[PDB]
RNA sequence: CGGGAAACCAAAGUCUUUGGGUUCCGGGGGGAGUAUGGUUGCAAAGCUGAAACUUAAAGGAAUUGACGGAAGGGCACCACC
């Protein structure tokens, strides 16, 4: 049918505020490090700019008295090519439900990505800010800054996540069992995620505090709301 | 982060732990922001003014946040440098 | 604080001495040691009574700093605190929970009991361990009443006291309700209060 | 043999007692008539089983509380153990003794002057 | 993989410990691997005591105890039901059974 | 105990081969 | 046995920084340790420090500010020439924008950026970032 | 604490943010601790020690089943008294 409103009504304090008042970006949700549990919050802020990618579909099974019982597991990545990326996984009895479930978890997992410069500071930033790494299982992944216009030097799996994150130039390295695509994807997303929590000399000045959104809008949640 | 024209280029600037001087990440759901009331000096009553602190999740789970909040409240005037 | 209008009076010190609040256990955890006066000749620790009043005023200054009183949540799963948390939540408009806490009340968004508070107060860290460990998923600050052998693992204000049972638990909740009502402006800092401490105590022999 | 009652019987009996406690009693043949007019029950054989467990529950409720059931008559006397008791007209009075190390702790806090004192044993009790 | 932290033996801070011979089968095993049982009982059973007290020559006598100490290997202790196998977390409990 | 018996089997074969060759010259 | 004192001093600071402690005690003291600490302090990575006399080599107490990611030692004191210094800072540093190698030279103990202004080579001691 | 494939380990930690000193020693599974030379011993034997040829896996930790002349509860005249 026709796409009218009221397909969503909030079930959390953050959802009640995002639908109504001047919460103006995801960055003021990240600043207070709040959990996101309604998928419609990220469609409100990023929306149709997000593009979607199925990395692998994988069968898994358990033994029973009668037969082997099979489920399908889908790996999905999502991003806007300008500083946001997410990864998600679900396992179901049918492939179409596994993909549809994986997209919701890939939206709830989105993080902010930091970018910087290899050389002199001309224009806008285009590479990782410093040498970083991430782990999952035995797999280790490592990212290194590069001069302007090299592109990404990597295997296929890490290249697709770095492209969706909006990084132009990068040198990369890996170790142990990369043939397991799930641990290779999570080790890459762990390295990308750490870029905004590495203490660097431009972040050394003293922090200035403000009230949180639940404190600024403390009466809006009471006077006409439940 | 600034470029050679002097303009800023970060998405946002993240907060740091008041006890420890380390960055609090976007998914650190064990972290907190504490808020504490000031009182007037003639009658011990709330005037609507307040002070705030932020604590890292790693310092909370090792049990050090109670002593950290106390040191911060003695460094500010609230506990008045005697005990 | 230093101020005379916030100083501990003789009549409060006699009420502490009368209820056993200053008497700890036979054991001490290394995080509680700064709250202790001495160990007796019989193996029992003495809690320092001036340390309690500073930490209780710091807790009241956190509770007053919340602009909607229903955003504060109050808990006791042991019986000795159940009458006390019900009276505390009547005197000032917090949300009480008494008896069994259901796992997932703070994190299962769909659940019939689901709630999302701004401050959490608990009667005993070892007994009330579910809402303490569950607060670590949702950015929720914590206040607790601690004995000499209490494990400090998620509490941000610990108040030194005997929390074993009887008159000592009820007195602490009554005195916390008195000072939050005083410094918010609802009762006098000099005239005695109309609510007797004995209203908060648990089940002395009735007849 | 087996005479255990299934959850369809046990839940319907509790919901009847919560709403209609003032109509009910110890006579099975009167309870059997009440349960037929306050509820729609598809079978005569199910109606007899529900009125049977209702008759068992009334004889329990006459002795004390049943954890799944609540009534005004039992809540208002709980509310009378709540509020204040008839036990005493004043608190247990603050005239209590002090040990020498608590006397020293109070001396450093600028207080005392209202308590008697005595010493403990010569060596730690075994 | 290793099943027990103590290797199933009491030996720590030592090289060699002397053997003993079992009370059922005379197998040879270390004094600190062997499963212990010290039994104290009456010479006369709880059924028989009344029949032997009434034929006694004395106006007061108390029937004596019998003392025996027993040693088993793992195979005899399991087969004679002196010990049972246990759950992976229950194996850690060192407290003896209740009375 | 198959490895200990394969070790014993090799020792008796080597004792035969020893005595056979050292007789020749 | 204790074959090198500068490696103890930096490993002791590095373990204290990771536990979140506000002070650390270094023992034994040395002329090399006091000159290395001074280079970190001048660039803003540690607070001020105090030396205790005991008639047996002495001790140092240092104040920590939470900014330091790592400090470390290269054990053989390899020689470096100005043409080869690029290879060492490509190996050891996290970015071209921050962090320092520390060298000993006949003009003194110094920062690898100062050795280029003074046109001098030397031996490697360690690094920080 | 932190580490690891995990079982587990206050060391088996302070490691891609990789350098305290120093000795012995491993390189897919077999043929093989074999043949041949040397050497020590009364003898049994110890020490040192190959190649031709052959092969797609051999192996470690853990999960769900099935199975036991393993243990503990309970049941059935298509089981027994």
Domain count for chain E: 1
Q: Which residues of C103-138 are buried (b: 16+ CB within 10 A; e: fewer)?
A: eebbbeeeeeeeebbbbbbbbbbeebbbbbebbbeb
Provide the token pair at F7. Answer: 């070790």
Sign of the alpha-carbon torsion through D49, D51, D54, D56: negative
Structural domain harbouring B42: 1-82
Which residues, at least 6 apart from A113, have a Cβ–Cβ distance to it below 8 Å?
Answer: A83, A84, A85, A165, A166, A167, A192, A195, A196
C-alpha atoms less than 13 angstroms from C-alpha of D109 in its C-beta half-sphere: 23
Discontinuities after residues in chain F (C–N over 2.5 A): none
Structure's resolution in angstroms: 2.9
- Give the span between the Cα atoms of B30 and A115, in whole angstroms: 26
Nearest CA in chain C to A219: C68
Q: Is E73 annotated as a binding residue?
A: yes
Nucleotide nearest the Cα atom of E84 (by C1'):
H71
Token pair 């011990």 is found at: B44
- Give the span between the Cα atoms of A144 and G94, in whole angstroms: 9
Contact B66, C152 (CB under 8 A): yes
Sign of the alpha-carbon torsion through D98, D104, D105, D107: positive
- Give the span between the Cα atoms of D81 and D87, in whole angstroms: 11
Distance from C106 to chain A by nearest Cα, in Å?
11
Structural domain harbouring C63: 12-207
- Nearest Cα to Cα of residue B29 among C73, A28, C107, G21: C107
Phi, psi of A68 (to 5 degrees): -70, 135
- Give the span between the Cα atoms of A97 and C12, in whole angstroms: 65
Nucleotide nearest the Cα atom of A65 (by C1'):
H65
Provide the token pair at E25. Answer: 């089968």
Q: Is E27 annotated as a binding residue?
A: no
Nucleotide nearest the Cα atom of A194 (by C1'):
H17
Domain G69-129: give its CATH code: 3.30.1490.10
Q: Where are the beta strands (DSSP E) in A4-127?
A: 51-63, 68-79, 84-92, 111-112
Phi, psi of A107 (to 5 degrees): -75, -45
Nearest CA in chain C to A214: C118
**Per-domain boundaries in chain G:** 1-68, 69-129
Number of Cβ atoms within 10 Å of the Cβ of C182: 22
- Give the span between the Cα atoms of E5 and A76, in whole angstroms: 44
DSSP of C74-140: EEE-SGGGHHHHHHHHHHS-PEEEESPPPTTTTT-TT-TT----SEEEES-TTTSHHHHHHGGGTT-
**Crossing angle between the packed helical segments C49-63 and C10-17, to the nearest 10 degrees:** 110
**Crossing angle between the packed helical segments D44-61 and D7-20, to the nearest 10 degrees:** 60
Cis, peptide link before residue D95, omega less than 30° from 0 = no
Domain G1-68: give its CATH code: 3.30.1370.30
Which residues, at least 6 apart from C56, have a Cβ–Cβ distance to it below 8 Å?
Answer: C159, C172, C175, C176, C179
- Choose from B5, B7, B14 for mutation: most chain A CBs within 10 A: B14
At C146, which helix (H) or strand (E)? Answer: strand C142-146
* A176 CB and strand H closer than 7 A: yes
Domain count for chain B: 1
- The structure's method of determination equals cryo-EM
Protein-nucleic contacts, chain A 111-150 to strand H, CB < 7 Å: 131-133, 135, 137-138, 140, 142
Phi, psi of A21 (to 5 degrees): -110, 180
Question: Which other chains touch chain D, taking contact as 3+ CB pairs less than 8 Å apart?
Answer: C
DSSP of chain E: ----TTTTS---S-S---EEE-TTT--EEETTTSEEEEEEEESS-TTTHHHHHHT-SSSS--PPEEEEEEEE-HHHHHHTTSS----TTGGG--SPPP-
C-alpha atoms less than 13 angstroms from C-alpha of D41 in its C-beta half-sphere: 22
Distance from B83 to chain A by nearest Cα, in Å?
28
Q: Is E25 annotated as a binding residue?
A: yes
Closest residue (CA to C1') to nucleotide H72 in the complex: E84
Structural domain harbouring E30: 1-98
Chain A neighbors of C140, CB-CB under 8 A? none
Hey, what CATH class is D7-62 in? mainly alpha
Protein-nucleic contacts, chain A 188-207 to strand H, CB < 7 Å: 198
């Amino acid at each position: 049918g026709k796409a009218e409103d009221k397909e969503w009504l909030p079930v959390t304090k953050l959802g009640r505020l995002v639908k109504d008042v001047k919460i103006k970006s995801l960055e003021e949700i990240y600043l207070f490090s709040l959990p996101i549990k309604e998928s419609e919050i990220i469609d409100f802020f990023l929306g149709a700019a997000l593009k979607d990618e199925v990395l692998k579909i994988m069968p898994v099974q358990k033994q029973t008295r009668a037969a082997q019982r099979t489920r399908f597991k889908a790996f999905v990545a999502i991003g806007d090519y300008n500083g946001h990326v997410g990864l998600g996984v679900k396992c179901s009895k049918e492939v179409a439900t596994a993909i549809r479930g994986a997209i919701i978890l890939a939206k709830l997992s989105i993080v902010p990505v930091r970018r910087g410069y290899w050389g002199n500071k001309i224009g806008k930033p285009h590479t990782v800010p410093c040498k970083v790494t991430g782990r999952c299982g035995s797999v280790l992944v490592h990212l290194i800054p590069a001069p302007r216009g090299t592109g990404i030097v990597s295997a296929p799996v890490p290249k697709k996540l770095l492209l969706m994150a909006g990084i132009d130039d990068c040198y990369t390295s890996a170790w142990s069992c990369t043939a397991t695509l799930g641990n290779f994807a999570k080790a890459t997303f762990d390295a990308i995620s750490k870029t905004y929590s590495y203490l660097t000399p431009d972040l050394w000045k003293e922090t200035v505090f403000t009230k949180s959104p639940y404190q600024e809008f403390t009466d809006h949640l009471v006077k006409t709301h439940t | 982060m600034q470029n050679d024209a002097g303009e800023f280029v970060d998405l946002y600037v993240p907060r740091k732990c008041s006890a420890s001087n380390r960055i609090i990440g976007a998914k650190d759901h064990a972290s907190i922001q504490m808020n504490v009331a000031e009182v007037d000096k003639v009658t011990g009553r709330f005037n609507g003014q307040f002070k705030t602190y932020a604590i890292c999740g790693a310092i909370r789970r090792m049990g050090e946040s109670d002593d950290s909040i106390l040191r911060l409240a003695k460094a500010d005037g609230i506990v008045s440098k005697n005990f | 604080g230093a101020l005379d209008v916030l100083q501990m009076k003789e009549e409060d010190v006699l009420k502490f001495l009368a209820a056993g609040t200053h008497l700890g256990g036979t054991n001490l955890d290394f995080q509680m040691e700064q709250y202790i006066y001495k160990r007796k000749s019989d193996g029992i620790y003495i809690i320092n009574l001036k340390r309690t009043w500073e930490k209780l005023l710091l807790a009241a200054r956190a509770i007053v700093a919340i602009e909607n009183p229903a955003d504060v949540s109050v808990i006791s799963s042991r019986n000795t605190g159940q009458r006390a948390v019900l009276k505390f939540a009547a005197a000032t408009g917090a949300t009480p929970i008494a008896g069994r806490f259901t796992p997932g009340t703070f994190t299962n968004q769909i659940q019939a009991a689901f709630r999302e508070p701004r401050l959490l107060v608990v009667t005993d860290p070892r007994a009330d361990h579910q809402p303490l460990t569950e607060a670590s998923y949702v950015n929720l600050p914590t206040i607790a009443l601690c004995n000499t052998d209490s494990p400090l693992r998620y509490v941000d204000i610990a108040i030194p006291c005997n929390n074993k049972g009887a008159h000592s638990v009820g007195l602490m909740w009554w005195m916390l309700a008195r000072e939050v009502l005083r410094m918010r402006g609802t009762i006098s800092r000099e005239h005695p209060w109309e609510v007797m401490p004995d209203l908060y105590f648990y089940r002395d022999p009735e007849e | 043999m087996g005479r255990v009652r299934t959850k369809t019987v046990k839940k319907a009996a509790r919901v009847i007692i919560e709403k209609y406690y003032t109509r009910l009693g110890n006579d099975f043949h009167t309870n059997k008539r009440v349960c037929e007019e306050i509820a729609i029950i598809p079978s005569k054989k199910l109606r007899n089983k529900i009125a049977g467990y209702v008759t068992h529950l009334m004889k329990r409720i006459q002795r004390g509380p049943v954890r799944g059931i609540s009534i005004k008559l039992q809540e208002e006397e709980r509310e009378r153990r709540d509020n204040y008791v008839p036990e005493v007209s004043a608190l247990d009075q603050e005239i209590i003794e002090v040990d020498p190390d608590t006397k020293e702790m109070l001396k450093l806090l600028d207080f005392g002057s209202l308590s008697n004192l005595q010493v403990t044993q010569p060596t730690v009790g075994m | 993989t290793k099943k027990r932290r103590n290797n199933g033996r009491a030996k720590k801070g030592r090289g060699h410990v002397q053997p003993i011979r079992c009370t059922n089968c005379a197998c040879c095993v270390p004094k600190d691997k062997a499963i212990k049982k010290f039994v104290i009982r009456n010479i006369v059973e709880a059924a028989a005591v009344r029949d032997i007290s009434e034929v006694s020559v004395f106006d007061a006598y108390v029937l004596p105890k019998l003392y025996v100490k027993l040693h088993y290997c793992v195979s005899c202790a399991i087969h004679s039901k002196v010990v049972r196998n246990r759950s992976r977390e229950a194996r850690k409990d060192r407290t003896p059974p209740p009375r | 105990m198959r490895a200990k018996w394969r070790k014993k089997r090799m020792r008796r074969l080597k004792r035969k081969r020893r005595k056979m060759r050292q007789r020749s010259k | 046995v204790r074959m090198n004192v500068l490696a103890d001093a930096l490993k002791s600071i590095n373990n204290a920084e990771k536990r979140g402690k506000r002070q650390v005690l270094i023992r034994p003291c040395s002329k090399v340790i006091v000159r290395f600490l001074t280079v970190m302090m001048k660039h803003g990575y540690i607070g001020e420090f105090e030396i205790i006399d005991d008639h047996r080599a002495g001790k140092i107490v240092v104040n920590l500010t939470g900014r330091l990611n790592k400090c470390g030692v290269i054990s053989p004191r390899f020689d470096v020439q100005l043409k080869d210094l690029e290879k060492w800072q490509n190996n050891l540093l996290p970015s071209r924008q921050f962090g320092f190698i520390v060298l000993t030279t006949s003009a003194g103990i110094m920062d690898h950026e100062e050795a280029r202004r003074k046109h001098t080579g030397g031996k490697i001691l360690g690094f920080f970032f």
